[PDB]
Design a protein around this ligand. Sequence first.
Ligand SMILES: CCCCCCCCCCCCCCCCCC(=O)OC[C@H](COP(=O)([O-])OCC(O)COP(=O)([O-])OC[C@@H](COC(=O)CCCCCCCCCCCCCCCCC)OC(=O)CCCCCCCCCCCCCCCCC)OC(=O)CCCCCCCCCCCCCCCCC
Ligand SMILES: CCCCCCCCCCCCCCCCCC(=O)O[C@@H](COC(=O)CCCCCCCCCCCCCCC)COP(=O)(O)OCC[N+](C)(C)C
Ligand SMILES: CCCCCCCCCCCCCCCCCC(=O)O[C@@H](COC(=O)CCCCCCCCCCCCCCC)COP(=O)(O)OCC[N+](C)(C)C
Ligand SMILES: CCCCCCCCCCCCCCCCCC(=O)O[C@@H](COC(=O)CCCCCCCCCCCCCCC)COP(=O)(O)OCC[N+](C)(C)C
Ligand SMILES: CCCCCCCCCCCCCCCCCCCC(=O)O[C@H](COC(=O)CCCCCCCCCCCCCC)COP(=O)(O)OCCN
Lengths: 71, 64, 104, 121, 71, 60, 375, 293, 111, 99, 145, 51
Amino acid sequence: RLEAEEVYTARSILHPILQAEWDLRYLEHQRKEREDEAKIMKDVPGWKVGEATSRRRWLPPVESFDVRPLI
Amino acid sequence: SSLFGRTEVDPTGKNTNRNHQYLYNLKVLGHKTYTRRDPNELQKAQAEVDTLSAAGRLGPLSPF
Amino acid sequence: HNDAEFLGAVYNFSIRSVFITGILGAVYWRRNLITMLLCSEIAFIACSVNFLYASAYLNDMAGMLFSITITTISACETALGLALCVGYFQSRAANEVEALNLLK
Amino acid sequence: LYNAMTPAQRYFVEGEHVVQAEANRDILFTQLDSNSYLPVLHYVLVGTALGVVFLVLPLLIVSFYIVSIMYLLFDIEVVYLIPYVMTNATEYMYWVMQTFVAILVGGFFYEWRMGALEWRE
Amino acid sequence: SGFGLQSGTARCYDWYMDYLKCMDESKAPMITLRKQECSEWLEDYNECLHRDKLKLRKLLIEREKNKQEAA
Amino acid sequence: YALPSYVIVSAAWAAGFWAIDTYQIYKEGKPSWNQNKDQFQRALYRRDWYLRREQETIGM
Amino acid sequence: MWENLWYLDILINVLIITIFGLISCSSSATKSYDLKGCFIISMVGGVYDIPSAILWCLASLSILNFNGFFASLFLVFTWISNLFAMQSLNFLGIYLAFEMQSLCLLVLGKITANENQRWFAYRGLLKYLVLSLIAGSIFIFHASSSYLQSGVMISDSLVTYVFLLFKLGVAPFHMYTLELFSVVSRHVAFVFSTLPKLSVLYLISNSNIGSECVWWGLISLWLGSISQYQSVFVRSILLYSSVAEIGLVLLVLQEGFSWEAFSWVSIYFLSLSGVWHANSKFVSAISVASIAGLPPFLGFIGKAQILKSLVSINLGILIFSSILAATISFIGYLRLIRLMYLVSPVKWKNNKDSSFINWSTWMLTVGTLPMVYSV
Amino acid sequence: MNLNIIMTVLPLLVSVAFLTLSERAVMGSLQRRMGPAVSGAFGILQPFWDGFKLAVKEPILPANAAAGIFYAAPLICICICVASWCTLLLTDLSIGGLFLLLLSSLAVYGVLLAGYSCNSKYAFLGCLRSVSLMISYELVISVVILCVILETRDGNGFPCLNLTETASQTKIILIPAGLLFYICSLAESKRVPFDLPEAEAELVAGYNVEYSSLGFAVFFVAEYGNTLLMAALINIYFLGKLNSALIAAIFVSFIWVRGTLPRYRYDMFMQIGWKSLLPVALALYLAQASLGY
Amino acid sequence: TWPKPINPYDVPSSPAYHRLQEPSYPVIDKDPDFWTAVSNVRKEEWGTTAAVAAGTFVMGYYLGAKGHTGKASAYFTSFLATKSITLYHAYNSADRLMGFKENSREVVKNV
Amino acid sequence: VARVPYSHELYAMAKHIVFRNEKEHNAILECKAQHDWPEDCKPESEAIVRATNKLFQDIMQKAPEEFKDYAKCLDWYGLKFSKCREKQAAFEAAFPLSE
Amino acid sequence: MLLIYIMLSNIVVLALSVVLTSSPFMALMYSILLYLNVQTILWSLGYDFMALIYALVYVGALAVLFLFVVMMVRIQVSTLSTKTIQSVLSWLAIILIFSYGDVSFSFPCGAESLLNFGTQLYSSCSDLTLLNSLALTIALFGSLV
Amino acid sequence: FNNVPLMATVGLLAGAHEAFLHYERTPIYGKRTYNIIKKLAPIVINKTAYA
Ligand SMILES: CCCCCCCCCCCCCCCCCC(=O)OC[C@H](COP(=O)([O-])OCC(O)COP(=O)([O-])OC[C@@H](COC(=O)CCCCCCCCCCCCCCCCC)OC(=O)CCCCCCCCCCCCCCCCC)OC(=O)CCCCCCCCCCCCCCCCC
Ligand SMILES: CCCCCCCCCCCCCCCCCC(=O)O[C@@H](COC(=O)CCCCCCCCCCCCCCC)COP(=O)(O)OCC[N+](C)(C)C
Ligand SMILES: CCCCCCCCCCCCCCCCCC(=O)O[C@@H](COC(=O)CCCCCCCCCCCCCCC)COP(=O)(O)OCC[N+](C)(C)C
Ligand SMILES: CCCCCCCCCCCCCCCCCC(=O)O[C@@H](COC(=O)CCCCCCCCCCCCCCC)COP(=O)(O)OCC[N+](C)(C)C
Ligand SMILES: CCCCCCCCCCCCCCCCCCCC(=O)O[C@H](COC(=O)CCCCCCCCCCCCCC)COP(=O)(O)OCCN
């Protein structure tokens, strides 16, 4: 029980930093993607790059690095 | 419960009809609601971070 | 272009085929009572797999609980049905030939 | 070998080096293939091939029904008990488990009382 | 249900709860009316569940990119 | 005599256990490859793998 | 933890009675009246409303005519399934409760058949099982597709409506009742053609499980009436009468008339009790008359509630069909009356076990005047 | 694939052969005899002679039986034994011992299929008796495993059934459950006390007796392999980290108990498993559950 | 996203059934124990319990005598009915303590 | 590209972070709890990333061998703190926490 | 991706084989192989315990029950082979019609945890676990008599 | 053309009913010289066309 509490404490400390670096990486990738999208959609009229799919809440990516099929 | 439930009348009359599902989810799971940060605060904070980085007080974005 | 869309379509085709093969298979190709209950099990398994798939899609536990319920009820139903089949077969009169094959 | 197909799965790492490294990788438990059942299936194929080789080499040169049903129903009861052992139970989880066990012990008592457990039949 | 697979809650539990809260706020005498008033929240929940708008947007981008490449 | 047959079984399994232990510790890189991993540990290992590959790409 | 105690008490009660009955099993008391009384007392702990009190009344009356600890235990299991069906909030509650009830039907049917009756009883139980498996599998497959598409399990859907249509036995999903109930014991057929209905009606009324389509009740009304008229066997006449009536009741219940269906089910139970447990010609005649809907008996009040509800919705086709189908049904009931007193001398077994039968006949005669307020 | 599979399979084959040699070496020692000395001098090579000779014997064409199922039964057993050992030594599967329990429930198929091949009225009852014994003592094994999982937690505190983590600590509390695991292991290997076969199988009631070539060889080899797997499981769960010496000692113990105990009748062993072993294992489970975390 | 860390020993859990209601009356005890609820049961309720117990003893004996086991049935029926009524009374008293139901007498008796 | 030290390193510096970097950790927790969108929390994410990287660098100079030794021990023992008590105590002595 | 596809496509061939075969014993064997393929499909969606459950309850126990019944009731069903070319194509057409153009959703991967599953089964969802236990008791009592 | 689908459906249901009744009686065990579909297809087609 005490080793578990130590491990939990450590993990709770690391989680903010890992989520912050993931979020920052997400932001640079999304920016690069939007730059490419704007480049591709320059010809098409009435297209707005960076339109919000969800009006209010942030939509997280369904696919994640952590979950990988067992087979 | 999650799968089953029964209904009783309120003698006092204070409690009234609301969605049972909503009330259950609020009591057992809870609702997380988030706001959107106003742009001026964010701009100032970001500028402050950048200023400190230029000064060199803050550390590297990447360790190596 | 998207592997997941292709895989989702393949899964949907496969699961639907397995369901129809279970429900209508033994009746179509006339079989004994034992094959009818085995195909009924195949169909229930297909539905439970669909629930597990949905639970993975929505990150929800409801399908996993419905699926454990299917496993329990399906096994109880099969055990009772097989008991009925044995009792039916032990009471067969000499004249009766394919007693188990009602669909004949 | 499952391969990440999106940038988010690849931890937003750019380049084609990563894709090649991932595809030609080895199944390591301390890397990208943890709790993987693919080795088990490689083992099943090896075992089947080994048997097939042995098999082909020389060629060139009422109580039972009752026990089955009781086994199936007790097995499902144990399947229900398996999640409980895999959690650090609280007082209320303990009492729910105790009710479940009481129902199982009642069914066992019915089997004992009615003579099903005796195998004379 | 509403519970998550690993912990917490389902991937789109909050969107559904938002829609339920909107329906609770509404004073319409029938459920049909309230759903009509809260339809936009339902559209957000459906959007988070299946990402249909994002898929359409990606399809259009890919198709235009193919058209540019062929030309 | 029971002892020679018993010795052969013991030694053969000891040799197999050593060979698998060393082989794995050589490839996986640690004696703890077999230890149980939860979701957090699996995600950490996956992140480490992707970060190492990114570092390799950056270096060259 | 206190809310859980209410539910927990029922389980504790059932287990202790089960183990007491097992320990005190002897030839001296084959009819365990004491256990029957304990079971009745136990089922009072699940009464929360008026529909639950009707469920208790019907279960207790059914329990009286079962012989032996085993049958009464399986009736208590049926009661538990019925109580949980009324409280089901999603697909899992519906599926679980109804399939448990199906299991209890399969056991009750199996354990009330003699060795000479096994050939036909086990065939009818097997046919019931296979049809039930088709219904349950189609239900769960569609429920899975709905859960995937919507993300939530909501009991307001076409999938549940079609499933509950199968459970009621209307439109083309009434054949299991005909095949199974013809070959089983009279009590088992009576208790499982009335009690299960109350739970389904409660679920439909409370969970808004109604459709705009009137074809299924119209079909059940016409098919049942014509098949009742053309049926030579008396069991088929009684079985098809329930099909026709439950079709009409289904049509009335979709439009929101819950009170009338809950009063109808109680009157129908009392009316069917005396015809099914036939011992006296007079009791059977009064029962047939009540099922027919003759005005001096309580059956008239039950039919009146449904007909009165029909005129409010103002659907002409339903009213016309109802009148003609009722006439056709009346011809079948007249056939039943003719068979008893106008065809040949009738001799029946002296099964002097009229537990609630005299009370039911009295309640049918006497009850019309007290319940006149409803109609 | 991986080179580890070779390093697992080859030791299993050598070890199983010497297991067969040990069985008779011990039985001879108990009965004031000696280990076979006409095959060679050291006696190391005695099993290879049997296996090589069994290869030479002329094949018999199958009679009045389906060919597929006849071929399938050896493949099924040779697959289960391999998968078991390779999931016992080369995997990190969080619920790995549960997988082993699943792999042990599949050993029933080989016996059943062998019985089906006979297609004899007596053999139908004989196979049903063997499978009844296996399922009856597999239920008890499952309850014992449940007792094993209450006491097995990992460093991070997450309950699981990883063989490495259960092996890491030795818990003396579980020893009451290890006795039941040992009796059940004897039953699952059809040892003498639970050896219903031998009495029934003197006449050709039905069993793997039908095979008399590479088919019969794999069955016997698999029998010893399963017995050794049970010995490994007894070591890994109740006796600490995997020790080759302990696995061999447990096998020797099996042989000793075999020799010193007479066989049981059909009703007697099954009555032991349902009305004796199962209540004891349930009491041990409830006691461990009530002790708490 | 990142998996949230879970503490195995303290995993959030809740009972199956929940009463969706805000306490209308004062909350004498937020989470009453069984003994606290039993101690707050009214005298009239205990009288009902004893009347039920006696009646069920007589009915149990009557029904048991037809099967030659009157005493055993009488005691079992008494125990069963007393237990069920007592649990009902304790549930009602716990609800009164929680403030869901009227607790005027309860608050006065135990301040 | 935002990047932070490897798992073994983060575990070895975990105790130090909450004593030395409290400000950034609290800030990031509060903002993350308040705002779902990742852009809204970009300043605090950048802050905690930079702070962790700075901590890694100052540990690498002040106690180069002690940190490396602890990180290797933790990696060898599969990120289990209990087995590395001696090395942890040495590293903590060499580089005191909470300044 | 190839392995997941192969398993998904195979499940159809293993389901078709059961109905087509005329031997009840062989149909069970194909069903057992179908159950194993379902375990392997579940492994690709990220479930380990659930896939174990399917194999334990169905392969381990239910299949044994089916074999026991089949042996006791053994009938001569090798009468005639009726698998005319016309019949098979009609069956494959019915299957194709039913299993076509349904709503498809992207393949998901979801890590499961027993700690959460056990917690929910014995706390929030205790009502289901006990009703299922009652269902098992009903089956036990009815089957044994 | 908008309202015929109903009549066509009813005719198809009636023809399927009659065709099934004919098919059910025919014996699987005995080999039949004639093709069953050739016998049954006119039933369904004619009923649907007349309706
Ligand atoms: C003494 C006072 C009684 C007066 C009033 C009764 C109310 C107080 C209850 C007091 C108890 C007396 C029982 C009489 C009524 C039973 C109702 C009831 O009890 O619960 C209702 C009551 C609250 O529910 P509610 O009053 O119905 O209102 C809720 C909502 O309004 C929602 O419920 P709703 O459905 O009523 O909603 C209103 C409804 C309007 O509904 C109505 O108008 C109802 C009309 C009343 C008809 C009465 C006949 C019903 C048959 C049931 C017979 C009672 C059996 C007794 C069972 C319980 C025994 C105690 O509107 C609708 O449209 C819904 C449709 C309703 C059905 C349609 C009515 C037709 C029924 C069939 C009639 C057909 C005729 C057939 C034959 C007739 C021949 C003459 O619950 C309680 O107070 C607690 C229950 C506690 C019971 C047992 C617990 C004590 C013992 C604990 C441990 C037990 C173990 C130890 C054993 C001890 C002994 C050994
Ligand atoms: C406002 C009321 C109108 C609404 C109607 C619904 C409400 C019901 C109100 C009155 C209900 C009365 C029910 C009448 C039942 C008739 C009594 C009965 O059935 O006795 C049986 C009882 O049979 C048994 O099986 C006895 C077993 C249990 C005995 C009673 C159980 C008592 C449990 C406690 C009940 C109290 C209720 C608990 C709290 C409400 C005896 O008959 P037999 O001996 O089997 O055969 C008779 C033979 N012959 C007539 C031809 C001579
Ligand atoms: C009037 C107030 C006091 C009445 C005295 C009764 C107090 C005794 C405590 C309660 C015991 C049960 C009450 C008796 C009612 C039913 C008992 C019964 O079934 O009567 C006979 C048989 O059944 C009947 O005859 C039916 C009688 C129906 C009830 C008639 C009695 C009416 C008043 C009794 C109960 C009134 C209230 C009881 C206290 C509240 C029992 O037969 P045996 O088991 O063989 O016992 C006889 C003993 N021995 C032969 C060995 C000498
Ligand atoms: C028809 C219903 C079918 C489905 C029913 C589902 C609903 C029932 C689900 C519950 C099953 C039983 C689980 C226990 C029920 C009530 C909970 C309970 O009483 O346990 C107490 C535990 O409290 C106790 O009083 C401990 C002593 C309990 C002793 C026995 C009471 C429960 C007996 C259960 C019956 C099972 C025993 C064997 C079955 C015959 C409450 O838990 P905690 O408050 O978290 O733990 C105490 C910590 N603290 C108070 C400080 C917050
Ligand atoms: C009493 C203390 C009070 C506290 C309560 C605790 C209760 C005991 C719990 C402790 C757990 C350990 C129990 C050990 C397993 C024995 C199981 C119960 C003993 C028993 O009933 O005897 C026989 C079962 O043993 C057998 O005969 C099985 C067959 C044995 C053959 C193989 C034996 C292998 C060697 C023994 C294991 C040693 C391991 C290492 C060598 C049944 O027979 P019965 O008919 O007489 O009983 C029926 C009489 N109604």
